[PDB]
Amino acid sequence: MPYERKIINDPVFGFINIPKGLLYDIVRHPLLQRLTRIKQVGLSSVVYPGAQHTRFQHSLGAFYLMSEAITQLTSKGNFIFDSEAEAVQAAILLHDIGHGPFSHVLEDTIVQGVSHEEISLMLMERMNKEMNGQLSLAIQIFKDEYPKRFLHQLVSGQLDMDRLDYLRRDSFYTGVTEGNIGSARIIKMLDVADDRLVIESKGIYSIENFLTARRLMYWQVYLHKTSVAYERMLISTLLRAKELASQGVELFASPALHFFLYNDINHTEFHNNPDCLENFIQLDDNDIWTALKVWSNHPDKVLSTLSLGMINRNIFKVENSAEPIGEDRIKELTLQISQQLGITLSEANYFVSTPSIMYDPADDSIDIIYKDGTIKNIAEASDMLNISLLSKKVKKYYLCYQR
Amino acid sequence: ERKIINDPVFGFINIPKGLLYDIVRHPLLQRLTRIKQVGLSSVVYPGAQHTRFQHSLGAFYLMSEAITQLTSKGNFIFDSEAEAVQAAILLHDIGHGPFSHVLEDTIVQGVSHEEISLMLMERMNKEMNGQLSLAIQIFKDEYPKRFLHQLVSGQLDMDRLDYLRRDSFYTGVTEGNIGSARIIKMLDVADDRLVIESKGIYSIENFLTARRLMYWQVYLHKTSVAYERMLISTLLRAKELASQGVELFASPALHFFLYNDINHTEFHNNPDCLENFIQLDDNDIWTALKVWSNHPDKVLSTLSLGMINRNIFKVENSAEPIGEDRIKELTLQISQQLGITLSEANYFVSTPSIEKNMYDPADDSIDIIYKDGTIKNIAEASDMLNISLLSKKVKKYYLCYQR
Amino acid sequence: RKIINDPVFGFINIPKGLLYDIVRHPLLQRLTRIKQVGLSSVVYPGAQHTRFQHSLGAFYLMSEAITQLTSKGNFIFDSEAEAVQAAILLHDIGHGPFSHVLEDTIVQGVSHEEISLMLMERMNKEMNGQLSLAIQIFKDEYPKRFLHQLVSGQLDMDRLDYLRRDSFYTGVTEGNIGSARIIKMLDVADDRLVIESKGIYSIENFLTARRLMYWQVYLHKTSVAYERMLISTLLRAKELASQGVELFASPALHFFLYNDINHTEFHNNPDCLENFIQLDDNDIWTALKVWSNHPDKVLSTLSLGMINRNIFKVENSAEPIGEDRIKELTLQISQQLGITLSEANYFVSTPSIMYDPADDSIDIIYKDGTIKNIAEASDMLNISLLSKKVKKYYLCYQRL
Amino acid sequence: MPYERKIINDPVFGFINIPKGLLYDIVRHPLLQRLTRIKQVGLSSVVYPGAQHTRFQHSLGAFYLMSEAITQLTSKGNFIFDSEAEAVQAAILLHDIGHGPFSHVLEDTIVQGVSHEEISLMLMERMNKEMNGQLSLAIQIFKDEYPKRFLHQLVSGQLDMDRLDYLRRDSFYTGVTEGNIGSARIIKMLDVADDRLVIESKGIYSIENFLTARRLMYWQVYLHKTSVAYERMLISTLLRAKELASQGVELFASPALHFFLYNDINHTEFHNNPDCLENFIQLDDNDIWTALKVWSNHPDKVLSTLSLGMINRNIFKVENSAEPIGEDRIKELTLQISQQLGITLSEANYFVSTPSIEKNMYDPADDSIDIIYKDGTIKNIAEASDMLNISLLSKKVKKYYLCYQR
Numbered sequence A: 001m002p003y004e005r006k007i008i009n010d011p012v013f014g015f016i017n018i019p020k021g022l023l024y025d026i027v028r029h030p031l032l033q034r035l036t037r038i039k040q041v042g043l044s045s046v047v048y049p050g051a052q053h054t055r056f057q058h059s060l061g062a063f064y065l066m067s068e069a070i071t072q073l074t075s076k077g078n079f080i081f082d083s084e085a086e087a088v089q090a091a092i093l094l095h096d097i098g099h100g101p102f103s104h105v106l107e108d109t110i111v112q113g114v115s116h117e118e119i120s121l122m123l124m125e126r127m128n129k130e131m132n133g134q135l136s137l138a139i140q141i142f143k144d145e146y147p148k149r150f151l152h153q154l155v156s157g158q159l160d161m162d163r164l165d166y167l168r169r170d171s172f173y174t175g176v177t178e179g180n181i182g183s184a185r186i187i188k189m190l191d192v193a194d195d196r197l198v199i200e201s202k203g204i205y206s207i208e209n210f211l212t213a214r215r216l217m218y219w220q221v222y223l224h225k226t227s228v229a230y231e232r233m234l235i236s237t238l239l240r241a242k243e244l245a246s247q248g249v250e251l252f253a254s255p256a257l258h259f260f261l262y263n264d265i266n267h268t269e270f271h272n273n274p275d276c277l278e279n280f281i282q283l284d285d286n287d288i289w290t291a292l293k294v295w296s297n298h299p300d301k302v303l304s305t306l307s308l309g310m311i312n313r314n315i316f317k318v319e320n321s322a323e324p325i326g327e328d329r330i331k332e333l334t335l336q337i338s339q340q341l342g343i344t345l346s347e348a349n350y351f352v353s354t355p356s357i358m359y360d361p362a363d364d365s366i367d368i369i370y371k372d373g374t375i376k377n378i379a380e381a382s383d384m385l386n387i388s389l390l391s392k393k394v395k396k397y398y399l400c401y402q403r
Numbered sequence B: 001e002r003k004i005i006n007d008p009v010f011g012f013i014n015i016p017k018g019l020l021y022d023i024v025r026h027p028l029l030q031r032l033t034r035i036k037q038v039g040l041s042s043v044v045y046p047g048a049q050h051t052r053f054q055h056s057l058g059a060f061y062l063m064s065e066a067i068t069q070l071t072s073k074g075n076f077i078f079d080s081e082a083e084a085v086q087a088a089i090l091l092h093d094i095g096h097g098p099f100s101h102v103l104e105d106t107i108v109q110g111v112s113h114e115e116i117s118l119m120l121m122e123r124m125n126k127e128m129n130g131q132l133s134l135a136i137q138i139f140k141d142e143y144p145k146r147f148l149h150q151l152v153s154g155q156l157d158m159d160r161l162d163y164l165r166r167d168s169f170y171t172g173v174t175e176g177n178i179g180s181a182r183i184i185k186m187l188d189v190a191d192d193r194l195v196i197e198s199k200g201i202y203s204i205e206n207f208l209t210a211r212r213l214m215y216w217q218v219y220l221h222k223t224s225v226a227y228e229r230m231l232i233s234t235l236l237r238a239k240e241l242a243s244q245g246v247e248l249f250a251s252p253a254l255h256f257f258l259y260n261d262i263n264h265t266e267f268h269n270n271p272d273c274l275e276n277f278i279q280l281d282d283n284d285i286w287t288a289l290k291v292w293s294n295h296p297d298k299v300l301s302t303l304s305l306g307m308i309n310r311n312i313f314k315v316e317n318s319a320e321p322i323g324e325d326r327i328k329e330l331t332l333q334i335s336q337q338l339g340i341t342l343s344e345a346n347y348f349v350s351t352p353s354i355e356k357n358m359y360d361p362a363d364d365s366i367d368i369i370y371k372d373g374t375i376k377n378i379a380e381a382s383d384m385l386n387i388s389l390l391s392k393k394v395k396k397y398y399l400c401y402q403r
Numbered sequence C: 001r002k003i004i005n006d007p008v009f010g011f012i013n014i015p016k017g018l019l020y021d022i023v024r025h026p027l028l029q030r031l032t033r034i035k036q037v038g039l040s041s042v043v044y045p046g047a048q049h050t051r052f053q054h055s056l057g058a059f060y061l062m063s064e065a066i067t068q069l070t071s072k073g074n075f076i077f078d079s080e081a082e083a084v085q086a087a088i089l090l091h092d093i094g095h096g097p098f099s100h101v102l103e104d105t106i107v108q109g110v111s112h113e114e115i116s117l118m119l120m121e122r123m124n125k126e127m128n129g130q131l132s133l134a135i136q137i138f139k140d141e142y143p144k145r146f147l148h149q150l151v152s153g154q155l156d157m158d159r160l161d162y163l164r165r166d167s168f169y170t171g172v173t174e175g176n177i178g179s180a181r182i183i184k185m186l187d188v189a190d191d192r193l194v195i196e197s198k199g200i201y202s203i204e205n206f207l208t209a210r211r212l213m214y215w216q217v218y219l220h221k222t223s224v225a226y227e228r229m230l231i232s233t234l235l236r237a238k239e240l241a242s243q244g245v246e247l248f249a250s251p252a253l254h255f256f257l258y259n260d261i262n263h264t265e266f267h268n269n270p271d272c273l274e275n276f277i278q279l280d281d282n283d284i285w286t287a288l289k290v291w292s293n294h295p296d297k298v299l300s301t302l303s304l305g306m307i308n309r310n311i312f313k314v315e316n317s318a319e320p321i322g323e324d325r326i327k328e329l330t331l332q333i334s335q336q337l338g339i340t341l342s343e344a345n346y347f348v349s350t351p352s353i354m355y356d357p358a359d360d361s362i363d364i365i366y367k368d369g370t371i372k373n374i375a376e377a378s379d380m381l382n383i384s385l386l387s388k389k390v391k392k393y394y395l396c397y398q399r400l
Numbered sequence D: 001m002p003y004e005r006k007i008i009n010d011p012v013f014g015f016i017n018i019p020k021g022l023l024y025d026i027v028r029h030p031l032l033q034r035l036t037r038i039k040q041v042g043l044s045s046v047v048y049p050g051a052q053h054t055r056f057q058h059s060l061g062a063f064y065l066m067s068e069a070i071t072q073l074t075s076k077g078n079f080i081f082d083s084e085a086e087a088v089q090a091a092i093l094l095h096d097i098g099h100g101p102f103s104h105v106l107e108d109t110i111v112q113g114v115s116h117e118e119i120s121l122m123l124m125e126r127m128n129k130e131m132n133g134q135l136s137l138a139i140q141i142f143k144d145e146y147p148k149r150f151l152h153q154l155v156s157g158q159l160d161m162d163r164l165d166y167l168r169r170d171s172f173y174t175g176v177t178e179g180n181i182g183s184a185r186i187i188k189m190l191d192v193a194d195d196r197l198v199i200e201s202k203g204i205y206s207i208e209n210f211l212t213a214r215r216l217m218y219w220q221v222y223l224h225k226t227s228v229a230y231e232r233m234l235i236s237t238l239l240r241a242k243e244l245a246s247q248g249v250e251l252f253a254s255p256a257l258h259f260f261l262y263n264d265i266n267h268t269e270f271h272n273n274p275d276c277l278e279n280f281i282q283l284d285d286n287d288i289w290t291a292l293k294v295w296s297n298h299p300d301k302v303l304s305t306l307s308l309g310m311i312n313r314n315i316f317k318v319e320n321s322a323e324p325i326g327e328d329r330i331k332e333l334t335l336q337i338s339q340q341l342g343i344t345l346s347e348a349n350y351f352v353s354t355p356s357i358e359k360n361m362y363d364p365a366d367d368s369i370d371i372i373y374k375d376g377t378i379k380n381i382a383e384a385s386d387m388l389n390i391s392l393l394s395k396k397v398k399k400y401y402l403c404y405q406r
């Protein structure tokens, strides 16, 4: 019998219908509300000022597409029980809950060796306790431990609701191009064969488009050189903060940020000391920006110069090469920066970065189902271009340094 | 003054009073109001109702923007040259009759729209006392400032920049949308040839992929291929019956081509051909089909009724040629099912094929200009796109037949 | 489910069975050859959308409306949902080409609503009574009365589609009337459609936009003039036909030109409906195209004006047009064209004007269950004043 | 081309071109970059999670439109010298520069009696000194003290680029497609007659939609009652934090925020003491949210309950009435909440709010737009419009809100 719903506005996909009960209670939970304070692609806003969308919007967006995908799969003779529908919807609402601000930066700096996927499971278990086991089936699906295995695939896999949301929403908000991966269309082509997700043959060119757009998104947005440079500055800022902290230097920070600056939190500490998760939960983009804003006037020349560059958008110069960067160049620039900033040679390392560089080539193996029940790999189904070659490794070296 | 015409795709289209408005209000351009841009596509995409008139105006709007942009980047264009390219683009598709390619294959054989466009341009030029002479010279690529012609016809022409966008908009195939106005903003000239500024590489990457998507998703949609084969049969049967002296309902203009054998020689040499061709639009074709659907001939009427009632030939495709034994089997089944001769059943079985190289420098070879004046082909400028990725021979063998 | 593309609302799912059988029926396929606003494309070239798209779009909106109403605990049986879905697919099926023009000229005294019912009954026979509930709802003869109101009334899916689609395709403004949102705010109170208070401004917008669509598009002076020209053309063709003059026409069109079909003849002689069914825009345009070379000066001049877009000049007044002005122009035209003074009446036209003000009386339901008329609920502007008669007087005449 | 131009992507309007030189220098200036950290409609995101756009975006967008407006006006023959073009472009880049985070809320709480308009001017003059007087003409046009007066009208007025951006952008980001306007289209119908802006009669339809869209966005978005309630909560929280601070209680705060919580800044003090501007410049939304985040665990029951409500989006219940709220209801609620939360009756005042609005829906300051015809005739839109007349639009609205802890 039809359920009552709350309605949220989403410019990308329209009206998001949220059933009252568990699902709406997830949306209103403090753990999902904190995602209104974490940008989806916060390192991209420096290139693409419109990229202000939140991880909250992504999670609702992915939910929307999940709802639609349930309806479409049932319509095609794939039975899904109401509890499975509910479970897969709660999974998708929660899938990204373990992201902190600039999550990958944190994993490389002050919250080392713990991944957002691990934190998402902890936070789901925590919430399941609070909701007295109502998320158990969601978690079981999330962990791919449920016998109906296409349901997990909707949460995590080549055709997951997560990437069908973010690839579209990130493009929509950056304004990078005016093109459109067909997220709502892709979902209407979805079916199950042998307990795995396939796409109907009428959706073939949509999948080639999808697969191509995905690679272009990486080059145009995610691996854009200005955003890589910006990321390297943030990594250096926080590693310098932790070095100063360890020396007992005083740094402005909210209590939750202070926890990770003045303690050495690593994988084992994080899982064993419950204070870590409690403090992690209290971190969002505000904690990071507030630090950078205050640090920009800190006496330390390295921390202040980095921090001021972040807030005032004085971005490192970036060069890219097809071959590694020569030790000669690095030494040269480090010296010149040492001199220009009046810092030691070792301090000048913070101002020179040489990061390397796509995703699992198997993501490109989508199976297409024909009206006569036959199945082909998209690479054979395809007419537009050579899908096999979309995954040829492109080696791209970056040189980032103070300008 | 200037006249303003609304266009949902691009907004206000501004048409200067004088020669350009005179072109727009001319009977030869007004008639394109009654010829669809993609008439065979509405059978799949009911939204695809846009006319060749809209496309002409649309390409004219884009041309006007291109002139402004090119002049703002320091490319000298005289007012007479501007006017001439504007006129050329208004007139570029003027020689299309209803279902133009179908007519070239059936009852107006061996004459292309390109030849007819030129005849009509010359005809209008006489009426307008030589005012289109420069436009015609640029149209033909016989003018020494060569980038102007490139805006009419070439990899970046205003024609495809209109149609890819317009066709996408009206079909609702948003995966083929292009940033037509964005591409124009990145347009420039280097060595009397059109180039795109490096900041527009992403726009061009989408442009090249969208063109491929629209090719297979819309223009070569198999339902549209089937429909076209049916129209080709219907008109051929009509010409066969007419040559036997059978009476067919037809407008005088259509009657002319049904009851005379018009070929290339005849078309150029007998001036009645062009006079009657000018009077053909989609209404002449659909009225014939509507009335012929009650004709006593079984072949003609069954084809005609299939057209108007949208009972379309079943269509199969194969990567290899259709077997002669399959064809004979179907032809025999259909001859029996409809009670017609084996020879007559030929009209109800068709085996068109496409052999296409997906990489074609005529559409793909676009040069990118950098801030330092260096120029790279898009295949080198693109991190993702490259000649190998795009180079792909596709062979598709269709089998279309009465169900 | 079959899936069809609609740029205005997205993908339209059509259940296999009855509903898809309606979509693919010859009677609905013919609506692909009749424009929703065919006299508008002369001003707005993008306005090429068909009655077929409108029917599918209204259907899309119906499907969403059902879901939403049931979500709020208004019970709809599956057969009722299907009924209302079928009704809205079929609601405009009785439109011929330029349907109001035909009702004023060569298919006089028969309304599209009447013809829609006949065609529904015809299809119901073919379909073994599967449309009986749909027809009963269409007639407002079913006791669950909010269902009919979805098909026809102040908040019907008909106008929620066409107000949006007509704006979309004309490109008249970049505004958006907001049709899918309005549906999400629908509820039933005392067996009638209401809107939740969260949608109040959506509704003021909707009511305002509707008026602006009337003035900007539906009553645009160039379109009025164009209508008058087509009216004259067809009346002249009927007159010539009645004198025994030969006119090019498809058999279907010939039937209405060479016989005098009125209300009683239409309902009593079954050849009428049969021929009407076979009329679409192509029959009218092919006639105009051929008539543009007809020996008759009145017919050919009118027809050539249509096909070449040489539109009557239009003036507007607040007061009726003076008889002396009319006589003056008629004389000038008779002289300029070399036709009799009576014949010159074809080239001078003075039509007058909005819709039922009760269409503006939508009820708003608040969370406490209280109900107010939108005019009291409203804060944006004076809803009551939207229906203040605007008296417009048109003078359309052949130019030169 | 003689100078390099920087191109910034905008989803709303596309490529935004910034000439190298003064204009790009303004865009890259730390005072404009800080607008990347201040939301355009920060109180709306609570209802419209898509409303994440920044004052920086709005600035760049209004500038984009201005660029097109200059081009369009000069194409209809109007004289805009390159220095006036530049000036009007710099004026619009800078027009909202004086907004701090939740600027109106600050004016009502801890930076009282100073409008963003005043602060914008102060920062414009500050930047002018930095740039050796290059912004002088721009300031002059901003102030409406330039003799070519239609230029100022492009910055501020019934057809200014400010509203032509924000109505479109706000509509785009909220997802209220009903408030969309054809900004570019309006600009294409723009001209000057008698040193004032006019709209060509072919644009009447756009101007009709423009005026209705403005009124819809006013009620649907800007005065959405959830947004009104959120704003009241934040006003309470900051007032309470200033109360506790004046009593010497210690509250977490960035230096810049601390300066306003631990000093009483008023109009006199803001203009006369230069530390006020220096610290204001350093405030953005991060300062406010980091305070609320840490205060949500503060010992004070009032502050912490308010703060946790903000961050967890447990918003005050909101009622509206056409008539004033009865003092009997107010006391009843204040008493209930005082008991429910275990705070003094005086402290429960923080949890009950009765703000109100009186609004004339017809304001010629927004609505009086002149339409020019082909024959040079001019009619006010009210006469030019078949539908939209003064009587349709003239409407006094009185709303009384009742916001309180739920």
Ligand SMILES: Nc1ncnc2c1ncn2[C@@H]1O[C@H](COP(=O)(O)OP(=O)(O)O)[C@@H](O)[C@H]1O
Pocket: A045, A046, A047, A048, A049, A226, A313, A315, D006, D007, D008, D009, D027, D028
């Ligand atoms: N102030 C700014 N704010 C946001 N984005 C900018 C700004 N300036 C430039 N951009 C965008 O970010 C990209 C990188 O800028 P940057 O690295 O500073 O210049 P460059 O074009 O020399 O690499 C540019 O391509 C431009 O689109």
Ligand SMILES: Nc1ncnc2c1ncn2[C@@H]1O[C@H](COP(=O)(O)OP(=O)(O)O)[C@@H](O)[C@H]1O
Pocket: A202, B042, B043, B044, B045, B046, B223, B310, B312, C002, C003, C004, C005, C023, C024
């Ligand atoms: N009656 C119709 N009118 C317009 N479009 C239709 C109709 N029926 C189906 N379509 C669309 O056209 C496409 C081709 O339809 P068709 O070739 O008849 O069926 P099939 O899906 O078996 O190929 C379908 O994918 C569908 O989206």
Ligand SMILES: Nc1ncnc2c1ncn2[C@@H]1O[C@H](COP(=O)(O)OP(=O)(O)O)[C@@H](O)[C@H]1O
Pocket: B003, B004, B005, B006, B024, B025, C041, C042, C043, C044, C045, C222, C309, C311
């Ligand atoms: N050739 C054309 N095709 C389509 N629309 C046109 C054409 N010429 C003008 N229009 C549009 O139709 C409207 C009516 O044009 P018309 O009545 O001929 O001229 P006027 O603007 O003098 O009334 C105009 O406002 C214009 O936007």
Ligand SMILES: Nc1ncnc2c1ncn2[C@@H]1O[C@H](COP(=O)(O)OP(=O)(O)O)[C@@H](O)[C@H]1O
Pocket: A006, A007, A008, A009, A027, A028, C198, D045, D046, D047, D048, D049, D226, D313, D315
């Ligand atoms: N968690 C949320 N985040 C963002 N927006 C929400 C959330 N919950 C509801 N909304 C939206 O904000 C509006 C106001 O919500 P709220 O005032 O809490 O509930 P009510 O609908 O009872 O007024 C709703 O109409 C809804 O669309």
Ligand SMILES: [Cl-]
Pocket: A081, A083, A084
């Ligand atoms: Cl189960």
Ligand SMILES: [Cl-]
Pocket: A176, A177, A178, A179, B178, B179, B180, B182, B202, B203, B206
């Ligand atoms: Cl693009």
Ligand SMILES: [Cl-]
Pocket: D228, D355, D356, D357
């Ligand atoms: Cl208020």
